[PDB]
Structures are given as C-alpha cells and as structure tokens.
Amino acid sequence: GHQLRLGVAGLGRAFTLMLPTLQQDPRIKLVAACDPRGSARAQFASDFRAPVYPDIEGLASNPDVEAIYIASPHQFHAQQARIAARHGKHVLVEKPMALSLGDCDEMIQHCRDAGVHLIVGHCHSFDTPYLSAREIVQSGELGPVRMVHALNYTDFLYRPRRPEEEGGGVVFSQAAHQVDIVRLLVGTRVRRVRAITGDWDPMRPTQGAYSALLWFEGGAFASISYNGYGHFDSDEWCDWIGEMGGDKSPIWHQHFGPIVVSCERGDIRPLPDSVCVYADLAKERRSLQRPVVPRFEVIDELYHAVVNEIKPLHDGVWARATLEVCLALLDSAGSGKDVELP
Amino acid sequence: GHQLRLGVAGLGRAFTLMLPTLQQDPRIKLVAACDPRGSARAQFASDFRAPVYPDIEGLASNPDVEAIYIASPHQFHAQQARIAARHGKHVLVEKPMALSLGDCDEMIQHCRDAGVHLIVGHCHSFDTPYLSAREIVQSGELGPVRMVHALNYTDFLYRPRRPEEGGGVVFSQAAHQVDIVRLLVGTRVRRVRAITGDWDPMRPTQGAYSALLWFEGGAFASISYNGYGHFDSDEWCDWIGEMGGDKSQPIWHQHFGPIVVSCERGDIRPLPDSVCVYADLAKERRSLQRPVVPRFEVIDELYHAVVNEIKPLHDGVWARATLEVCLALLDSAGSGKDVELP
Numbered sequence: 186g187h188q189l190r191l192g193v194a195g196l197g198r199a200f201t202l203m204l205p206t207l208q209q210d211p212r213i214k215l216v217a218a219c220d221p222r223g224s225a226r227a228q229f230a231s232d233f234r235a236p237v238y239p240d241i242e243g244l245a246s247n248p249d250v251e252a253i254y255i256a257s258p259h260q261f262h263a264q265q266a267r268i269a270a271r272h273g274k275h276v277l278v279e280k281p282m283a284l285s286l287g288d289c290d291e292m293i294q295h296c297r298d299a300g301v302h303l304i305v306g307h308c309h310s311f312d313t314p315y316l317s318a319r320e321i322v323q324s325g326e327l328g329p330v331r332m333v334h335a336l337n338y339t340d341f342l343y344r345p346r347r348p349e350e351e352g353g354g355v356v357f358s359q360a361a362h363q364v365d366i367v368r369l370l371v372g373t374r375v376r377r378v379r380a381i382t383g384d385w386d387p388m389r390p391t392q393g394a395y396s397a398l399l400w401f402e403g404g405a406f407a408s409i410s411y412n413g414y415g416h417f418d419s420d421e422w423c424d425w426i427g428e429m430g431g432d433k434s435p436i437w438h439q440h441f442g443p444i445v446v447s448c449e450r451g452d453i454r455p456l457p458d459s460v461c462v463y464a465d466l467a468k469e470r471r472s473l474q475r476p477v478v479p480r481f482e483v484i485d486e487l488y489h490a491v492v493n494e495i496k497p498l499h500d501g502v503w504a505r506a507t508l509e510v511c512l513a514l515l516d517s518a519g520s521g522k523d524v525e526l527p
Numbered sequence: 528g529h530q531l532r533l534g535v536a537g538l539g540r541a542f543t544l545m546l547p548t549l550q551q552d553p554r555i556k557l558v559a560a561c562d563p564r565g566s567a568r569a570q571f572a573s574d575f576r577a578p579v580y581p582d583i584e585g586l587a588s589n590p591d592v593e594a595i596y597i598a599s600p601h602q603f604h605a606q607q608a609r610i611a612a613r614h615g616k617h618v619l620v621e622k623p624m625a626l627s628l629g630d631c632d633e634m635i636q637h638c639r640d641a642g643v644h645l646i647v648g649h650c651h652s653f654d655t656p657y658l659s660a661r662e663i664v665q666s667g668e669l670g671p672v673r674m675v676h677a678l679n680y681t682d683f684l685y686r687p688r689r690p691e692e693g694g695g696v697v698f699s700q701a702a703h704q705v706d707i708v709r710l711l712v713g714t715r716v717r718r719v720r721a722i723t724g725d726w727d728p729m730r731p732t733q734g735a736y737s738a739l740l741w742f743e744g745g746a747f748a749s750i751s752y753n754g755y756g757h758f759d760s761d762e763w764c765d766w767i768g769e770m771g772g773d774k775s776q777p778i779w780h781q782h783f784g785p786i787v788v789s790c791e792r793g794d795i796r797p798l799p800d801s802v803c804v805y806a807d808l809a810k811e812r813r814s815l816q817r818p819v820v821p822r823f824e825v826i827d828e829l830y831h832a833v834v835n836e837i838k839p840l841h842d843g844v845w846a847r848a849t850l851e852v853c854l855a856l857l858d859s860a861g862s863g864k865d866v867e868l869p
C-alpha cells in the first residue's frame with residue numbers, strides 16, 4: 186500500500202549497495218528474503234525480524250510480499266522473475282536484467298501475463314542529474330540531440346563489485362550504465378554500433394576498456410569510452426564527486442563519469458551536484474537538490490508503478506534494449522565489424 | 528647561419544599567428560616576404576626594413592633567403608614549394624601541407640631532389656607537453672600505448688581563423704588531433720571509422736565528429752571534436768587556452784584539448800603546464816618549463832634541420848600521412864564505412 190512490502194531474493198553485493206536506499210526510503214518495508222546461504226538468511230532474519238527462505242518459491246509464496254527485488258546472480262534472474270510473476274509479485278531485478286535476449290523476452294512475457302510490473306534494478310540512468318538533463322532535451326529548449334560524448338575512467342577491474350567479472354565483464358556491468366544514460370538522453374533507437382575493446386592485463390584476462398560509436402535513429406551519434414584499469418580517475422571532471430555521491434579531495438547525486446550532450450542549440454553537462462547548460466545566450470550552472478535518500482529515483486519508479494500504475498521508464502523492454510546494445514558492442518569488438526540493430 | 532634567414536610567402540592569418548614566434552626566437556631573422564597584396568607587402572617592408580615581392584619567384588630569387596615559410600592558402604603550397612626547392616631554399620609550409628596526396632607527393636619529391644628540408648608549419652603535435660608525453664612512451668616506462676582518448680570542444684565554427692572554411696573542421700582541426708595521436712602512439716594508423724555532425728544551416732559545414740582509429744600493434748584511439756562553441760573543454764586542461772593563455776605576461780604551452788594516453792601500465796595526461804602520470808605506484812604531476820618563445824618547437828625542427836642536418840620529425844612524409852588519415856575520416860563519414868589505410 187503506502188509502505189511497499191518488499192521481499193529480497195539474493196542478499197549479495199547488489200543488495201548491500203541498495204540497502205541504505207531500502208532502509209532510508211519511508212515507502213519501503215523489507216518483509217522477507219531468500220538466499221541459499223544460511224549466514225545471509227540468518228543476518229536478514231536478525232536485522233529485519235523477518236521470515237527467510239532458502240529459495241524463491243518460499244519468498245514468492247509469502248502473501249505479505251507485494252514486490253520482489255531480485256539481486257541474485259544473473260543466471261537465476263529469468264527463473265526468479267518467472268516464479269515471482271506466477272505468484273502475482275511485482276519485480277525489481279538488478280542490472281543486468283539477464284545476459285541473453287531470450288531470458289529477457291521470457292521475463293517480459295511472464296510479467297506481462299501475470300499483470301505485474303517489471304523494473305530493472307539500479308541503473309545510473311535513474312540518477313537525478315540525467316533525468317533532469319533528459320527533461321531539458323524533451324522540453325525542446327535546446328532542440329534535438331545531435332551528439333553525445335561519454336567517458337568513464339575507473340578502477341573497476343581491480344576494485345570492483347566482484348561477481349560481475351562469460352567473457353565481457355566491463356561491457357555487461359559498466360557499458361550497461363553508459364549505454365543506458367546515452368539512450369535516456371538521446372531518446373531514440375540505437376541503429377548501429379562499432380566497438381573496440383582493450384585487454385592488456387594478463388592477470389585480468391577480460392576486456393578492461395573500450396571505445397564505441399553509436400548511430401541513433403534521427404542522425405544523432407554518440408561516442409562512449411570506458412577504461413577500468415584504475416589509473417586516471419575521471420571523477421576529477423565531475424567536480425571530484427565519486428560514483429556513489431561521495432566527496433573526493435550529506436551526499437550528492439550518483440553519476441557514471443563525464444558526459445556532454447550536444448543539442449542543436451547547446452550542450453548539457455549533467456553533474457552530481459548540478460546541470461550545466463551552455464547555450465549561445467547564457468552559460469548556466471542549474472542547481473540540483475541534494476538527495477535525502479540515495480537512489481530514491483529507483484523507488485519512485487517502483488512505488489509509482491505498483492501503487493499508482495504509472496508505466497515506469499526503466500521497464501523490461503527498456504533494459505532488454507540496453508542489453509541488446511551491450512551484446513552488439515561485444516560482437517562488434519569480437520568480430521571487427523559493425524552490428525546493425527533491428 | 529647562427530640566425531636562420533627566413534623568407535615568408537603569404538602574409539596571412541597563419542603568418543600573423545606565427546609572428547610572435549618569428550619575432551622573439553633569436554635563431555630567426557625575417558629577411559624577405561612575398562604577397563600578392565600590396566598592403567601586406569607594404570606592411571612587411573615597413574615592419575622589417577625588408578625587400579618584398581608580388582610572388583614566390585621573387586622571394587625564391589633573393590639569395591640571402593635560406594628558408595621559406597609558406598603561409599599562403601593551401602592551393603599554392605605545391606607550386607610555391609616546388610619553386611623554393613628549385614632555388615635551393617628549405618621549406619616550412621603551414622598546415623595543411625596541401626589538400627591532396629598528389630600535391631604532397633610532388634612537394635616531397637621536389638624537396639628531395641633539390642636536397643632541401645621540408646617541414647610542415649605549426650601543428651599542435653609540436654607542442655612540448657606532447658613531445659614530453661611521447662618521451663615517456665618511447666622510454667618504455669609505462670609499456671606500450673594501448674588506448675588514447677582525445678576530445679576538443681571549441682568555438683572554431685564561429686570564432687575561427689576563417690580561410691580554412693570540403694570538410695573544414697577535419698582538414699584544420701582533426702589534422703592537429705590525428706597528428707598528436709600519431710605522435711603519441713608512434714605506429715601507423717591502419718583503419719578509421721568516422722561520423723561527422725552538421726547541424727547548423729547558417730554554417731553548412733561539418734562542425735563536429737567522433738572517430739575510431741586502429742593502430743599497428745593493436746592500440747586504438749577515439750577522437751572527438753565539436754566546434755559549435757558551447758561547452759569549452761579548456762575547463763579540463765587547467766583552464767588554459769589553445770595558445771597558452773589563462774582563462775580562469777608569462778604564458779603556458781599550447782595544446783589541443785583533453786587527451787588521455789593509456790599505456791599498459793599507466794596513463795599519461797599531457798597538460799599545458801605539466802604532464803600527469805598515473806601509474807600503479809604513484810600519481811605524479813611532472814612540471815614543465817614555461818616556454819620563453821611560443822611554438823619554439825617549430826623553430827627547433829627548422830633550425831636543427833637546416834643548420835645541423837637533423838632529420839625533422841614533422842617532415843613532408845609525416846604531414847602527408849596525417850592528411851591521408853584526414854581524407855580517410857571524411858571518406859568514412861561521407862560513406863557509411865571503414866577506410867583501410869595502406
């Protein structure tokens with residue numbers, strides 16, 4: 186109802202990252218959890234005075250549960266979403282939604298059939314500075330987007346959230362956010378992708394870096410670069426605020442590295458603490474409110490979908506679209522040619 | 528001799544940009560000029576008490592001239608270099624060397640045959656911060672280059688030098704970018720994929736681009752440029768402008784926008800006032816000396832070529848190679864496909 190009664194499937198790293206949000210947002214009450222590990226279940230029952238289960242059948246069968254947050258490893262998402270849906274539970278599943286388009290399709294179908302909402306976990310494209318930059322684009326204040334340039338230099342490869350890195354770890358985890366933000370901002374279909382990955386650390390035989398071109402319906406183009414190898418830190422270019430809102434040198438908004446949106450008549454630079462507008466008339470630092478609850482935008486989509494029936498932007502269809510781009514990046518770098526997106 | 532005796536062909540915008548350099552560098556004496564404009568000739572005779580001519584035949588026939596600086600519009604370069612060479616004058620020609628590979632070939636051949644040195648005008652790849660970053664890469668200190676990311680957001684399209692506008696921002700602006708990237712990686716470009724953007728009717732030329740470059744040995748670069756004068760990426764180069772000025776009279780080095788060089792074991796960020804090295808052990812701001820003469824690196828190549836016979840890095844062959852990449856960018860953007868380089 187007023188307090189969304191949330192069950193959690195998979196009490197891992199994603200869950201723990203999401204916890205301050207679920208704790209501090211007054212719209213959420215944690216009512217149950219499942220986890221195959223006894224020590225996680227035990228932690229949760231203690232922490233939230235709440236029933237726990239070894240699996241999703243148990244969580245999904247608890248009728249007090251209204252919605253299930255899926256933070257299990259990716260290969261259980263499709264199954265866990267299916268079971269939640271069968272039992273009339275709305276679903277918030279972490280990025281990645283799934284690692285195949287087939288899993289995603291099934292997920293969409295099952296939630297569609299059960300008549301429950303399907304929203305995809307935390308993605309940085311939920312972050313207020315991007316929603317706000319999206320608002321500018323959609324307002325027509327600067328005309329349509331023509332070019333987007335995005336870059337993130339991080340230490341993901343060596344100081345990550347571990348179980349995400351199946352090959353292309355930084356694509357499915359890191360490019361997911363980047364592509365999502367770019368899609369949010371441009372607001373049209375990706376039609377073509379061309380990607381180069383870099384992989385130059387034997388100790389870490391996975392792709393740690395990439396550069397990609399994206400062509401969008403309507404003729405806007407994006408370039409996105411990522412480097413996970415932990416040397417230069419591009420938070421220097423985001424007013425020295427880290428990914429999770431923290432100060433580097435009472436939080437600010439989350440972000441995913443320097444991004445410049447070029448509209449026909451001006452540039453938008455979303456920052457963790459403001460949105461900078463460069464138009465031919467004025468140069469503007471437009472203030473943002475400091476978030477009281479981190480990642481509250483995630484809870485907004487969920488709360489409004491379940492309580493008010495408002496179709497959420499970050500649905501299954503949306504997330505599957507980002508997955509498809511991510512698969513296309515990997516195919517492009519792997520094969521050395523363009524991928525065309527239907 | 529000790530003072531290189533320099534004739535100037537074409538007293539245009541390039542010349543005037545180069546002038547503080549030619550004035551202040553003690554190795555240079557301006558001894559003669561040609562220009563089809565009587566008012567430019569008159570200005571020069573007055574300023575430098577020096578003989579002037581309507582054309583290159585006159586400048587080339589002055590036997591006191593040791594070297595000729597060609598600052599004429601591009602379509603006269605090949606002819607003016609041919610004539611200089613015929614008369615045993617060394618040649619410094621502005622970027623662009625020429626706009627066709629045929630012109631360039633002729634230029635190389637003529638200077639080769641006459642036994643005179645051929646160097647290509649100012650290019651930002653001459654700038655000390657890049658030479659210094661090059662020194663690090665070539666030293667093996669951080670291992671080979673694996674990735675380069677370069678971007679420049681400027682007001683070129685609307686506040687340019689103006690006789691530089693086919694594909695104006697490619698031949699003028701991407702020339703510097705590609706040159707810097709070539710200098711830094713230090714191997715051949717093998718492949719290019721480019722998108723250009725052109726979204727101002729009042730300015731029906733390409734004002735923006737993003738391109739992928741593959742290099743021999745597997746390094747890749749991505750380069751982005753946007754000339755539409757909104758965001759100003761000098762913000763990311765310690766607020767120092769292209770020509771070394773402060774944008775918050777001793778000045779700093781010249782540059783061509785934010786560049787990050789990823790070597791196998793570290794990143795190099797060349798800045799107008801330092802070279803930042805991010806290696807696994809330490810993060811280092813390596814200081815540079817403030818130049819006494821702007822663009823002295825250009826006079827170093829010329830002076831050392833003519834007086835000491837040291838083959839210059841920025842020769843005709845080198846410059847032609849950047850032109851070839853630039854043609855390839857335009858061909859790639861213009862068509863929907865990769866261009867492979869010989």
Ligand SMILES: NC(=O)c1ccc[n+]([C@@H]2O[C@H](COP(=O)([O-])OP(=O)(O)OC[C@H]3O[C@@H](n4cnc5c(N)ncnc54)[C@H](O)[C@@H]3O)[C@@H](O)[C@H]2O)c1
Binds near residue numbers: 196199259281346
């Ligand atoms: N690591 C991150 O920061 C992060 C962020 C975004 C999304 N994700 C996604 O969420 C997934 C969950 O892993 P994590 O990164 O949160 O850390 P993690 O591996 O510590 O957490 C996953 C935990 O979920 C539990 N789980 C629940 N149901 C399960 C089932 N049926 N079978 C097996 N285990 C089950 C397991 O005990 C497992 O340890 C990741 O694989 C990734 O796909 C992770």
Ligand SMILES: NC(=O)c1ccc[n+]([C@@H]2O[C@H](COP(=O)([O-])OP(=O)(O)OC[C@H]3O[C@@H](n4cnc5c(N)ncnc54)[C@H](O)[C@@H]3O)[C@@H](O)[C@H]2O)c1
Binds near residue numbers: 536689
């Ligand atoms: N505009 C710049 O700042 C800049 C920078 C780098 C290189 N360049 C290159 O140098 C070229 C020179 O133009 P500019 O931009 O310096 O400005 P500009 O057009 O003011 O100067 C070029 C002048 O050279 C003179 N000239 C000399 N010999 C000539 C000849 N044989 N025929 C005709 N004119 C002759 C002309 O009077 C002409 O006006 C440009 O076209 C460009 O290719 C320009």
Ligand SMILES: O=C(O)c1cccc(O)c1
Binds near residue numbers: 346359
């Ligand atoms: O959504 C997240 O929790 C997250 C945070 C860090 C990186 C990543 O892959 C995802």
Ligand SMILES: O=C(O)c1cccc(O)c1
Binds near residue numbers: 541
């Ligand atoms: O090399 C130059 O003199 C120059 C100066 C500014 C920008 C440009 O296109 C070229």
